[PDB]
Amino acid sequence: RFASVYAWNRKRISNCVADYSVLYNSASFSTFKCYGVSPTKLNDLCFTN
């Protein structure tokens, strides 16, 4: 079950190593916009939280 958009869920992702290529290389997503960040270099960048 996902959230109702009026009550949109939030989860903190932290203290971990990502691989956004697992997401972006998948064909099932119909839309994958990014703002201030590029979906490829997203996998080279790193974040506080």
Partner: protein, 49 residues
């Protein structure tokens, strides 16, 4: 013009950056995922212009 002067376009995606004074008018779909694009978008690919 009202509704948009779609006479003008730019390349939104490319697999790699241009060399100085290079030009690329190709319409081949840009690839984001595992497979070749086979002439369609969303299937691992998106249109670059």
């Amino acid at each position: 013009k009202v509704g948009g002067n779609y006479n003008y376009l730019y390349r939104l995606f490319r697999k790699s950056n241009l060399k100085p004074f290079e030009r690329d008018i190709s319409t081949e779909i840009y690839q984001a995922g595992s497979t070749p694009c086979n002439g369609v978008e969303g299937f691992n690919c998106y249109f670059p212009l």
